[PDB]
Amino acid sequence: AITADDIAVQYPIPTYRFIVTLGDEQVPFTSASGLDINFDTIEYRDGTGNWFKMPGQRQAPNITLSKGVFPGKNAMYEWINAIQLNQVEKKDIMISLTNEAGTEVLVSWNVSNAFPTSLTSPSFDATSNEIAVQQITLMADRVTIQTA
Amino acid sequence: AITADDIAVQYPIPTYRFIVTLGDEQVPFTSASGLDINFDTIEYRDGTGNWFKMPGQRQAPNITLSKGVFPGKNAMYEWINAIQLNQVEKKDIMISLTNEAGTEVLVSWNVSNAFPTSLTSPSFDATSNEIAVQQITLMADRVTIQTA
Amino acid sequence: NWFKMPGQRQAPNITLSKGVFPGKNAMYEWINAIQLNQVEKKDIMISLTNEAGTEVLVSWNVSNAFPTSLTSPSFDATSNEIAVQQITLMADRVTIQTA
Amino acid sequence: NWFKMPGQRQAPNITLSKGVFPGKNAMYEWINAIQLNQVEKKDIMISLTN
Amino acid sequence: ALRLYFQNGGGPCYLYPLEKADDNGPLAALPDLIDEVGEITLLASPDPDETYRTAVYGALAASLDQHKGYFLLADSVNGDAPSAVGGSAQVAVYYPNVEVPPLSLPPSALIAGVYGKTDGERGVWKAPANVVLNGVSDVSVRVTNEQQAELNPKGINVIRHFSDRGLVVWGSRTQKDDDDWRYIPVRRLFDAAERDIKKALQPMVFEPNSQLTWKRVQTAIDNYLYRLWQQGALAGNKAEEAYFVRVGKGITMTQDEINQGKMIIQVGMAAVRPAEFIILKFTQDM
Amino acid sequence: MSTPAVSHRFLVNFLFNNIPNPFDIAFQRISGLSRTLEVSQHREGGENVRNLWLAEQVNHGSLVLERGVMNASPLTLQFDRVLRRESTQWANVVIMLLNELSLPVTTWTLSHALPVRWQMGDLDAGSNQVLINTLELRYQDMRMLGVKL
Amino acid sequence: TTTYPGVYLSEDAVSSFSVNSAATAVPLFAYDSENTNTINKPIQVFRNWAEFTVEYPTPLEDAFYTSLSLWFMHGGGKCYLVNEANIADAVAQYDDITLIVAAGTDTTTYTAFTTVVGQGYRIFGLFDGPKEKIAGTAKPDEVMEEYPTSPFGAVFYPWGTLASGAAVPPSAIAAASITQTDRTRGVWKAPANQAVNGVTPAFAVSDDFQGKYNQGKALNMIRTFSGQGTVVWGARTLEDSDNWRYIPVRRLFNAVERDIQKSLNKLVFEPNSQPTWQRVKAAVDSYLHSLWQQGALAGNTPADAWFVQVGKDLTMTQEEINQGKMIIKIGLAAVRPAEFIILQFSQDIAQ
Amino acid sequence: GARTLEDSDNWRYIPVRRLFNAVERDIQKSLNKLVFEPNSQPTWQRVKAAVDSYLHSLWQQGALAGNTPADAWFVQVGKDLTMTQEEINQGKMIIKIGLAAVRPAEFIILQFSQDIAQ
Amino acid sequence: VTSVPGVYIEEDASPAMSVSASATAVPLFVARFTPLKPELAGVITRIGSWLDYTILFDSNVPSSVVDPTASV
């Protein structure tokens, strides 16, 4: 007897159900990785034996999003095609673990000013039963988590 | 009930059906990889805490195409044999995901000024049931995608 | 604390088998119309019926099925059997309606 | 403007392997006869045959 | 007006050339020609004359309440409904005339474009009311909030101008003031689901009217309503809270109704309503 | 805050008096313009704790340019005349960075630049490189303009 | 008139001013209804000084000409000449206005200022002081009774005496120190101590005189000092409350509340559900975190500088969901300026 | 002087006429190697990518006016875009190509002011 | 009073309060609560959050030396 309204509060959350809001729109992705929060470290030792350890300053995240190639338009391509030498429409990304029906966000990760730095083509292979998958790598400045 | 004219619009595209137009001709290849769009990154930090992130300038692609050794002439060889010290017939390559019959291009990748930098021989092995496969690596300046 | 949870449901693989009749082969005409992605998906309904054949007792519904295999009969000169083709299907959902 | 040119080609490194037979070692008497700069340089044909 | 239609999202786009307004011959023969073609969904007559549209809106008003699934896109003149179609749920009025480099066009040719753009990208259950109008530059009347506050509790659906965005269609209400059929995306979801169920059950006409056929019809509707729920159209969390299909002999029918050759099916759905009011409530106490 | 200026897009305009047309030449490696004021330290008798710096004379640097060996431009034909001592003409140089669109964000605007040094790259049998030649000018005054000063 | 392909030598050249605009300063200059040398067009748009002199080519000596010519010579972007009768409708139609500048205008801009504030349009009015010399036996209550008691306005007494002899309205002096402040320091910094050039205060004002006129309705003097020539000296609004004193902290929230609704107007007609409420509060947390890390918000941690809150038992009820409403509550702390500096002196001889 | 024998907005200025003469001749020298190919949708994609590859190199050397590739040229070919099925059957392949050229400066106005001892 | 479909702004709101979920501590506060609508005067009402208290009960109740402390 566990009555699955208690599963929604007590049990953990699986990885396979997620939505990615990218700017003003949602794009269906297959994978999403790299949303880390990493710090540097500062030290100091003196001759009497005191050894001080401090957090440094955090470095920038590298997000990786992969989806399939569809017969419409390539919406990841027209955001990496429009790089003019310094300039890029920087977007804010939300990657939200969602429930089955899709009507409730469980926990989400917020990427703030992301811009594309790489886009890989699918690997064409005449002996493979696979889907054409592109992946895009993004560079941001902070990653936050809101838990609601 | 999905009526496969809807599969041609909604479902993704597999990797095994593709044609490679190389200059003024089509050559049947087995693999094709490396059609990436990669950028560098420029940063700037000052003492008040502002941290600026910018796309750099994109680096050149390295394409890789592999096909088998056939009893005719080696058309990949007479394009890498004709290197005279700076000079090479630079070609423009289209790698198009095609439908079954071959009568409709779904999405294609356009390589602009490619020239060969490497060509590997097959690996002769008296205990192997394999096909003699050469691969050629190419160097270009831009990769675009047209979606039609 | 052990936490046990149902994952995501995987695809059903339905296998059907019928005999070879002298007319037109409807199961060859549906597995021959494959062009690299493009197949007419169909709705399968397998209903346990009364002896007259006119009312459903309980039914097993199958949402978007397409053929993945079709086996030929085994030809044997020393056998008194009927030529039976066996088609296997792949779908996404199995539904049980009871009425 | 970004100009891309082929450079100059580098030298190949071929690798040939065979078994050890009870006769004489014909690959050995071609690598034994290295005198400090000098080697009988040969021309090799590797032909896919019927 | 057609070039602004294809710039905003094209379509198969049926046309009926009707030269002058007062010829009551071709206008009386108009609703009989619409039924002969299978696939008209929107009406949206794009003409700048005022008395021309009133003759068209009056000729098409009798065909909107006949369960055929049409949807009229009328145009206001000075801030009210054109009164040939008063309070039916099949009508969406759009007030400001839109100026093209300057000739002023009624906005129905553009809004018929942005329905096809929204339905292709988001579905019919999405409110078609944040689309920036391509082509055109400026509306003829810049509408304030205070006159939209007396217009939006009618179905007037003002084309607004925002400085950062441009010309945005702003409003998704119908002429019906009922709680059920207040919004455009709730109304056109039911019109599109009834149209696609009808196209699916026409192979099951002139079948034997038995219990085996009633289950084949129930499953064909249940397979359709399940793949609306799993793409976000229906407002449910369990798929027994989104829809239901009912057919039987003790349920939904009587034996006297089978004998006269008909089957009766009860289908229900549950749609989601859009968020059209956002209240911010700032403070500086913490 | 507005984005800082990157350093890989730049135009250079030359204007000689021998040559009737102003010409624009693409370079690889403009070195960098310095401008020193050349103070001198004075030591006073009774003062031991502060310093005293006296302004004298503004010193300008040098414009070192690099480009590949390409077809003969109106500037490599002009260094050839000055380094053969057939002319001593000097030019007004305008150097400017470009933003994403086309717009000049900073401009440096040198005056009476004189060609003083040619330097050829190395010829090496195994090298895999473009033959780069190094050009160098001494100017009289310098006046930076633009919105990104 | 250009005919041949050569070089034309014209010698009727006039002045020109480069635009150095701020996006948060788009003003409305109100000209009088009974003004003779204005074009019958009641609402007209001026992006720069070149478009203003193609419609007003001769240099006039009126209140609207010397307000706009003092606007454009200190940067300044697009701006509106609106007749006094259409000030409540030009704010309601043009979506872009942040300032209502009474360029020598009384009692009609005031009653149309208090119309659009009650309608909630997030503007800030800049009114005028008396054109005559305030005596000193005049009382701050009887002088400050023309003006509304709303926190969206400031008054600015001493009129200008522009170098060509003309008189500048003191709302135009105040609006030209808002443009130079909204670039170099931001909208959260006070428009006061930035110096405006080319103008001169008509009267010399003491600081014993400003002490009577500071608390209560806040006259906001325009004073000249040696060095910093003719700054505006004061940054208080027309109410003396703990919240809505100080023109910075009102104009900060006007910029916050307008940049949030420009971000959340792209989320209107989305489905009123719990995934949409999470997208609202993360679009506001992403706006307010960037605003905190550039000095606009008071707090040494993100929990002390802002909060965003939205729920189903937090900010709105289920009977209020069904009306299409989405209540977000946002609290945020602003930085108050320093206004008084006390120099406490001690000395003792030969010690 | 650099003007042609008509004074129109398009075809004034000897540069922008001789630019399109060079564009239209270098495109047909590239597309004459695609004549008698099968009139099908894979061939139409090879035409519009041979023109996009010509016009992108021409944009990045200053011949075309535009700060992005979408403002400098477009190539368009389809079955409901540029040609109909009754026009496919005659062997025709309609490509439409629009591209923006750079107009020269022709007049330079030097507006002078001075005032003595100021 | 919301009629325009845009975004509305208010400026003197109070901060909302969060509520938790528990099944072992459900209290019955007997104090001097002043209702707004007088049908819930002698009965027990459920108050699921602080927002439910402000709608059903008077949450300001201005004082007169006596001070209302049930809402605090």
UniProtKB/TrEMBL annotation, chain C:
It comes from Serratia entomophila. The gene is afp1. Keywords: Plasmid. This is Afp1. Coiled coil: none annotated. One of its GO terms (molecular function) is structural molecule activity.
From TrEMBL, chain E:
Keywords: Plasmid. Residues 102-174 form the Tail sheath protein subtilisin-like domain. Residues 177-282 form the Tail sheath protein C-terminal domain. Belongs to the myoviridae tail sheath protein family. This is Afp3. The keyword Zinc does not apply. The chain holds residues 114 to 449 of 451 of the full protein. It comes from Serratia entomophila. It comes from the Bacteria.
TrEMBL record, chain F:
The gene is afp5. InterPro entries: CHP02241 (IPR011747), Phage_T4_Gp19 (IPR010667). GO terms for molecular function: structural molecule activity. Keywords: Plasmid. It comes from the Bacteria. This is Afp5. It comes from Serratia entomophila.
TrEMBL record, chain G:
This is Afp2. Residues 240-345 form the Tail sheath protein C-terminal domain. It comes from Serratia entomophila. Residues 89-238 form the Tail sheath protein subtilisin-like domain. Keywords: Plasmid. It comes from the Bacteria. PANTHER family: PHAGE TAIL SHEATH PROTEIN (PTHR35861:SF1), PTHR35861. Belongs to the myoviridae tail sheath protein family. Pfam families: Phage_sheath_1, Phage_sheath_1C. The gene is afp2.
